[PDB]
């Protein structure tokens, strides 16, 4: 009932007991269940939309809030590509010219025809 999809299934159930969905992972492990593997007593009512709250369900972290976590991830993505873009204005220039090649730019060596000399050839 916590999530917006669990709320959206209230009018379907008619005889279903409608229990509180709680993750199988955030139960403690030290209580001795029937199923130590999945943290579940033998006859325990499964939830509306169980397989998101299974042990085989996703990992479901519990340290940050997911909204905060979204802010911190996009914050690192912003602080990298903003700083690396601003730092292209503070770049120093090169001390050397680009090097050069003979034979009118090696136009003939990388393919080429006399009419076709524009597409092939570098730095005459």
């Amino acid at each position: 009932i916590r999530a917006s999809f669990d709320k959206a299934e209230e009018p379907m159930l008619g005889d279903y007991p409608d229990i509180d969905p709680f993750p199988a992972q955030l139960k403690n492990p030290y209580k001795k269940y029937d199923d130590q593997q999945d943290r579940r007593n033998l006859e325990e009512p499964l939830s509306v939309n169980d397989d998101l709250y299974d042990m085989w369900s996703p990992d479901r972290f519990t340290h940050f809030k997911n909204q905060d976590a979204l802010k911190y991830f996009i914050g690192f993505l912003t602080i990298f590509f903003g700083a690396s873009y601003v730092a292209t204005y503070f770049v120093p220039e090169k001390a050397a010219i680009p090097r050069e090649f003979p034979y009118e730019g090696l136009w003939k060596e990388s393919g080429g025809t006399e009419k076709s000399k524009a597409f092939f050839g570098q730095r005459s």
Binding site: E109, G111, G112
Partner: protein
């Protein structure tokens, strides 16, 4: 024994006899595989040009590379139903 059956066009074969129609279908088909083996032969020659040339493949067989990229849209299977169901200049 490598047999060579005859070529029959679709033009003027009277599509009411199933003998000449089916031979026209198979002939246009088999000539189309022949038309493809030229592509498969120039590809085999272009790779040997490349492997022997090494670094100067850019200028040794520019003609074979451009040759292969010229044949490639126009040497493939295309269907006898395109030319049988339609007539040009009508």
């Amino acid at each position: 024994e490598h047999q060579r059956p005859e070529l029959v066009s679709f033009d003027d074969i009277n599509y009411n006899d199933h003998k000449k129609v089916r031979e026209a279908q198979e002939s246009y088909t088999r000539e189309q595989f022949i038309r493809l083996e030229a592509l498969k032969t120039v590809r085999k020659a272009l790779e040997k040009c490349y492997e022997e040339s090494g670094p100067n493949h850019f200028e040794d067989c520019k003609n074979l590379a451009e040759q292969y990229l010229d044949m490639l849209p126009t040497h493939r299977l295309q269907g006898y139903l395109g030319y049988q169901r339609n007539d040009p200049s009508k």
